[PDB]
């Protein structure tokens, strides 16, 4: 993937793989040999996302992902 996208019922969380890998670097999320990050509604709301945001981009809280 490169620009993973997820259509939600209350907004959207257009993810990024390549566009992100740029700043991230895989390891940023994964750790030696990828596979998955089990995202849905529990982790994506944890360190998963909320962690490497409060610094760049700007909106890290509500509105960040779910385009509001
Ligand atoms: C305001 C603080 C928020 C509301 C309202 C919702 N979120 Fe999020 N969110 C994020 C991700 C990466 C996901 C996983 C994608 C997936 O669903 O597979 C989610 C998911 C949701 C869900 C689940 C949707 C459903 O009912 O199927 C809901 C209801 C939801 N989010 C509401 C990411 C982010 C995030 C990144 C910056 C923020 C700040 C929030 N979500 C905050 C909200
Ligand atoms: C959970 C899978 C994530 C969601 C939801 C979002 N990200 Fe990120 N993110 C990071 C940086 C350094 C930026 C700015 C630079 C860039 O991405 O190249 C972003 C940006 C966003 C955006 C806006 C993208 C844009 O160019 O406008 C959204 C919607 C977004 N992120 C949602 C960093 C990180 C990161 C650090 C390791 C992680 C794990 C994530 N982002 C994950 C999520
Ligand atoms: C660096 C270029 C990489 C590599 C080698 C991998 N990714 Fe990621 N990844 C992230 C998340 C949240 C998931 C799960 C998505 C969800 O369930 O919503 C993934 C998943 C993977 C896979 C498995 C999925 C598949 O494509 O079948 C693989 C093989 C993978 N990744 C490899 C998150 C990030 C991310 C932070 C948002 C960054 C940067 C990357 N991934 C980058 C990489
Ligand atoms: Cr919450």
Swiss-Prot record:
Any GO molecular function: metal ion binding
Residues reported to bind heme 1: 17, 26, 29-30
One Gene Ontology biological process: anaerobic respiration
SUPFAM superfamilies linked to this entry: Multiheme cytochromes
Superkingdom classification of source: Bacteria
PTM entry text: Binds 3 heme groups per subunit.
Keyword Ribonucleoprotein: no
Binding site for heme 2: 20, 49, 52-53
Keyword Metal-binding: yes
InterPro entries, per database record: Cyt_c_III, Multihaem_cyt_sf
Keywords recorded for this protein, A-Z: Electron transport, Heme, Iron, Metal-binding, Sulfate respiration, Transport
Residue positions binding heme 3: 45, 62, 65-66
Function, as annotated: Participates in sulfate respiration coupled with phosphorylation by transferring electrons from the enzyme dehydrogenase to ferredoxin.
Name used for this protein in its record: Cytochrome c3
Organism: Desulfuromonas acetoxidans
